[PDB]
Amino acid sequence: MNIFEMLRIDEGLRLKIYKDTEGYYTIGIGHLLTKSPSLNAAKSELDKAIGRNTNGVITKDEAEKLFNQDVDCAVRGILRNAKLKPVYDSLDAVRRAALINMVFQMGETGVAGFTNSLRMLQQKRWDEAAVNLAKSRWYNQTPNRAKRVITTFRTGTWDAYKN
Ligand SMILES: *SC1=NC(C)(C)N(O)C1(C)C
Ligand SMILES: [Cl-]
Ligand SMILES: [Cl-]
Ligand SMILES: [Cl-]
Ligand SMILES: [Cl-]
Ligand SMILES: [Cl-]
Ligand SMILES: [K+]
Known part of the structure; x- marks a missing residue:
């Protein structure tokens, strides 16, 4: 398991434009195209x-190409952000994947707003951070995916994604 396999599970793979969980036009492996309601714009x-x-x-090769760019974009959003980078630096590689996952789904600005959760993660208070992460619109709107990501932060294992 790795960030690519993890996000492939959470986002699925569709080769035609579709709407994501927020109603936004998307393609491939969770590649958000636009928040505009215009399909022509998408x-x-x-x-x-x-x-x-x-x-x-698009083809599957094209979907995987966007996906690799999108993972890179998520990591770059973390590394350029003064709130996210110290947390990322403080994490093991399994939990780093969980943070990339969050930024992939919600963007740099959204995750940087989890100020108190980020502090708990940097303190390595995993059970407390897990409870705090679930007090979120994120968890309420996508609870099964958030549970998997939170379980990854809580345990530092891939147990939520195996099987
Ligand atoms: S990677 C990446 N994605 C967006 C479009 C947000 N960017 O401006 C980068 C940093 C080039
Ligand atoms: Cl076709
Ligand atoms: Cl590329
Ligand atoms: Cl592109
Ligand atoms: Cl440490
Ligand atoms: Cl809390
Ligand atoms: K998706």
């Missing part, structure tokens, strides 16, 4: 991301 974003005129459908 299709233009896809053409720009892939570099060709699409019909709203």
Whole structure:
């Protein structure tokens, strides 16, 4: 297990434009295209991301290419953020994956707003951090995925993703 396998489980894989859990046009492995309700706008974003005129459908290779870019973007969002980077630096690699997962789903700014959770994670108070992370819109709107990510922070194992 690794961040790529983890996010592939949490995001799935779809080769045609679809709406994510927030109703936003998405493609591939959780690649958010736009928050605009315009499908034409979403299709233009896809053409720009892939570099060709699409019909709203991509290949699996293209989905995996966006995915690798998106994982990189998530890590770069952490490393450039004064609140996220110290926490990331303080974590083992399994828990680092859990933080990347959160930033992939909610973006740098969203996760940086978990000020008190981040402090508890940096203190390595895992059970307290787990409870605090669940007091969130994030947990309430996607509780099964959040549970898996929180269980990863709590235990430092991949147990929530194996099987
Ligand atoms: S990677 C990445 N994604 C967005 C579009 C947010 N960026 O500006 C980067 C840092 C190039
Ligand atoms: Cl791109
Ligand atoms: Cl088609
Ligand atoms: Cl690339
Ligand atoms: Cl430490
Ligand atoms: Cl709390
Ligand atoms: K998804």
